[PDB]
């Protein structure tokens, strides 16, 4: 699987959820595939996707929320998982696009991410499913927190287009849709 198909899969499974994407090529690819007001692109501050997501799911617990992490972003601030397992937000979804490298940087090898599903289940995640290349779909429980491990092959497509939204515009649209939904 490539990142394009994985992002399209995640967007198809939850087309009515708010997403927080980590910095680098993941946010760029998400913005290029589908630009949504419910998408919060973190242009910088790597490793903060999951903390911001936990705060959002703390204030708005009923809303479904997806964190779009990579293997490098997940690993950099791994300890946050404990807090998530401690908070156990029922509608928190943790996606990890694992390509085994810092791709948005040049393809440098990351620390190998092993048995992510099991340790996710240990810290307090209600379910942690793994995805091999070619899985059409899967039915997931409506009660989280959840962890989705999608091992994606290195990209062959073009880098895409950088997100043109000013960070202030990103927070404006995100907050406005959050207020309009409830």
């Amino acid at each position: 699987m490539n990142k394009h198909d994985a992002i399209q899969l995640i967007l198809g499974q939850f087309p009515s959820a708010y997403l927080v994407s980590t910095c680098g090529h993941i946010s760029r690819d998400l913005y290029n595939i589908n630009d949504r007001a419910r998408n919060f692109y973190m242009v910088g501050s790597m490793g903060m996707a999951a903390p911001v997501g936990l705060g959002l799911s703390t204030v708005y617990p009923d809303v479904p929320l997806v964190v779009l992490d990579g293997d490098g972003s997940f690993l950099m601030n791994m300890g946050i998982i404990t807090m998530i397992g401690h908070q156990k937000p029922k509608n928190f979804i943790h996606v990890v696009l694992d390509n085994g490298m810092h791709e948005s940087t040049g393809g440098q090898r990351t620390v190998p991410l092993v048995n992510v599903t099991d340790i996710a289940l240990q810290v307090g995640y209600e379910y942690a499913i793994e995805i091999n290349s070619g899985q059409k779909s899967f039915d997931l429980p409506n009660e989280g927190p959840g962890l989705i491990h999608i091992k994606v092959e290195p990209r062959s497509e073009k880098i895409g287009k950088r997100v043109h939204w000013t960070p202030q515009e990103i927070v404006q649209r995100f907050t406005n849709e959050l207020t309009l939904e409830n």
């Binding site: 919060f40 973190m42 242009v43 910088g44 501050s45 490793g47 903060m48 999951a50 903390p51 911001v52 997501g53 936990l54 705060g55 959002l56 799911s57 703390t58 204030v59 708005y60 601030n77 300890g79 946050i80 404990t82 807090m83 401690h86 908070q87 960070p167 202030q168 990103i170 927070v171 995100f174 907050t175 959050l178 207020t179």
Partner: protein
């Protein structure tokens, strides 16, 4: 006393959400935070945090939920979450009131606080983080000025605490 007045003035002005990593000088604040009495009485949403950066990220996320949050921390932890402030809060204009424990402010503290103690204000000024020194005679007015500044700038402001509360 001082911690009670600070927390009361913050709660009256709709600052109810808290993340932090403890320090010796901020013990009374964490007492009032972890008190089951104050959580139900003052409507206090406190989230334990493993690291200052995760605390700041969760605080920013809670701000994105339409709530006003402050963050407690030892000044040493500023060297752990600084990137966040320089790559998220001041870039996205996400304000979080910072209650920093100024360890080593007088140079007689433990050896681990020597550098940060004499260079805290210089660090904040070089990196353009605005701060206010806690006036222990009128702490409510100091945090009032801090809240005024963050509402004027939509960016975080720190309150520096060098004596025990």
């Amino acid at each position: 006393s001082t911690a009670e007045r600070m927390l009361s003035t913050l709660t009256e002005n709709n600052y109810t959400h808290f993340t932090g990593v403890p320090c010796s000088l901020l013990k009374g604040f964490f007492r009032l935070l972890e008190s089951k009495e104050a959580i139900e009485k003052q409507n206090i949403t406190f989230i334990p945090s493993i690291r200052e950066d995760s605390a700041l990220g969760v605080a920013s996320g809670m701000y994105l939920g339409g709530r006003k949050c402050v963050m407690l921390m030892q000044n040493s932890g500023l060297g752990y979450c600084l990137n966040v402030l320089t790559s998220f809060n001041f870039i996205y204009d996400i304000p979080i009131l910072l209650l920093i424990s100024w360890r080593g402010a007088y140079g007689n503290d433990a050896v681990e606080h020597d550098i940060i103690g004499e260079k805290l204000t210089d660090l904040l000024d070089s990196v353009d983080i605005p701060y206010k020194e806690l006036d222990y005679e009128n702490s409510e007015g100091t945090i009032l000025d801090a809240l005024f500044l963050i509402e004027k700038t939509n960016r975080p402001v720190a309150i520096l605490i060098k004596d025990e509360i």
